[model samples]
Target: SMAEWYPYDAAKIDPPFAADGKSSDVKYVPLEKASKPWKLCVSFPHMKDAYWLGVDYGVAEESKRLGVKMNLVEAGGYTELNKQISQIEDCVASGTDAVIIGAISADGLNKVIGEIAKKKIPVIDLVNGISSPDIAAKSLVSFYTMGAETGSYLAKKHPAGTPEVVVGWFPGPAGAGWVEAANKGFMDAVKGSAIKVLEPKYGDTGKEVQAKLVEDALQAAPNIRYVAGTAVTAEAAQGLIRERGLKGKVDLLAFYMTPGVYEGIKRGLIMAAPADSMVIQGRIAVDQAVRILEGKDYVKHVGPKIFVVDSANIATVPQANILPPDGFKPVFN
Candidate 1:
C-alpha cells in the first residue's frame, strides 16, 4: 500500500517536450521567493466527486503542514469552461504567487495560461494534466499509459481465439487532456487482436450519462462483450448490469480509480481498476510548487507508482492510496 514502492518505473523512458504536450525533462534551479510565505491558488474542474476530494485533501493537508496560504476554487463541472476562465482571472488579479489547475479542457485554457506566464507566475498542471510549455511541472497519472495498460488488461482477459469480442470504450468528454491519450493507448493494446471496439461513448464523467451510454450500447449491439471506461462509467453500470443479469455475460471495468470503483471492486461489482495514487499526486503537486517557490530542487515531472487493484489484493492495499475516507470534506473552501 502506501509503504510499498510504486510499481511503474519512469526512469526507463525519457519524457517528452513540454511544448509538445508532455512534461519536459528540462530541470531548473529553485527561484526567488517573497518575504512572506508565498500564496497559492489551486483550481479544480469540480469537487462533486470523491476523486477530486481526495486530491483536495492531499493539497490541503500538505499546505497546512507547510504553512503556506492557499485558496482553492472549482468550476461546477467540465461543462463550465467559462467559469474556469473567470476563476483564473480572479486568481491572477489577486496577486497569487502560483496557480495549480486540474484544467477543464486540454487546450481551451492555454490562452489564459499564457496570460499567467506574462506575470511571471508558475503553473503546475495537476490531474488530467494540461498542455502548455509554460507549465513549471506536472504531477499526474499519464492518461496515455493508463489507457494502454487498460487496453492490455482487457485484451488478456479473454483467450485470443475465444471469438471476436466487442468492447464498448467510454473515453470521457472530448478535448479533455486525458481522453485522447487514453483512447490511443487502449486502441493500441487491442490492435491486431479480435477485439473490435465500437465508436467510443463521449460525455461527462457522470453516472447517469455513463449508464445511458451503457444502455444504448447494449440495445444496439446485443452481442457486446465488454464495457470499459472512466470510473463513473463502471460505477453507474453496476446496477443496470446486475438488474439485467449481465454479471457473467459482460466484463465491466474502469480505466481509472475512484472511491466508488474501489468499493465496487471490493464488493465484486466491477471487475478491476487501475490506481495512480491520486491523493499522493495532490501532495506532490503542492510539494513541487513549494520547491519552485523557495528555489529548492524538485523533479520537473513526478508521478506515483501505478497498480491495478482487485478484490484479491484489497486487504493488502491502503485506503489512502486510492481514495479519501467516506464523508471526507475538502479541507479548504
Candidate 2:
C-alpha cells in the first residue's frame, strides 16, 4: 500500500485555463475509499517511457485501494491522434463512468472531448495538457512552468555579466502543444540573462533521436555550456557526455522528472528537473472521478505542486512522489 500521501500541496486553477492559468494553493486529500466501484477508462499518449510509468503505477494502485474497475489504453505514440480517439470512443461505448486522458495534442482531441461531454460522461485531463473546456478536472502542471524552472535554474546561476554562456535547447517534437509551451517558457525565462540559447532543435523524444540532435548541437558549438530538454535527452546525453569526456564540462538538464532524470540528479550527471508529481496527478484523477460520480464537491482544475529537484535537495525528496520504482513494469489494466 502507498503511504498516506495526503494533505498534499496542490494548486487550484482559476477559470480552468490550460497554460499560465491563475492558481491558488490548496492542500489535497484523496478519499479513504470510494463509495462505489465505478468503472474508469484511462488513455495515454504512450507507455514507452518512465514518466508515464509513474502515472500508471499511481492509477493502478489507487484503483485497487478504491476498489474501482479501471481499463487503460496507450495510443502507441503522439502521432496517433485518430487511434487515441477511437480507443476512447470504444471505451465510452462499452460504458465507463468516466474517461481520463493524457492527451497527445492539446487541441486535436477537443472535438471528441466535446462529444464525450455532450453524452454527460465526465472527462478528466491527466498529466499532459488538454485545451477542452469540457474536461471536468485537470491533473497537470503547466509545461510552461516546467520549462521556465529548467531555464531559470541556469539564468540565476549565470545572471547578466557573470559570463556569457551558450545553451543547446532541444524542446521535444516540433509543434506539439507541450513542446511549444515549454519552448516559449524557456526562452522567456532566459531572456535578458547571460544565457544565449541556440536555435531550437526539435525532435521526437526517443533516446537515440535526441542523442543525435544533442551530438549535432555539440559538434556545431563545441563551447556549448548546457544540454537541456526532454528526459530522454538528459538520460541519453549522460553516456555521450561521459564518452566525449565532457562530463562536468557540459551540464545536462531535463524539463520534467523521470526515473532516469532522478538518478541523474543523484549521481550529479544532470543538474535539475521540475517534479510535476505526476504520480499524485494520476491518483488525484481517480479521486476526482469518484467525487464527480458521487455528486460530491471537487476542485475543477487541480494539480500537485511543482518543485525542482537538484543535488541540493535530492536526498530529502521522496522518490516515489515523482518517479516510478525501479523495475516497475507498465500495467495496462
Candidate 1 residue-wise lDDT, 175-196, digit = tens: 7767898889889988877788
User: How many residue-pair clashes does candidate 1 contain?
Assistant: 2
Q: Each candidate: how many clashes?
A: 2, 0
Best by TM-score: 2
Winning candidate number (lDDT): 2
lDDT of each: 0.79, 0.90
Candidate 2, lDDT over the whole model: 0.90
Per-model TM-score on C-alpha atoms: 0.78, 0.87
- Candidate 2 lDDT, 254-282, residue by residue in tens: 99888888889998999998899888899
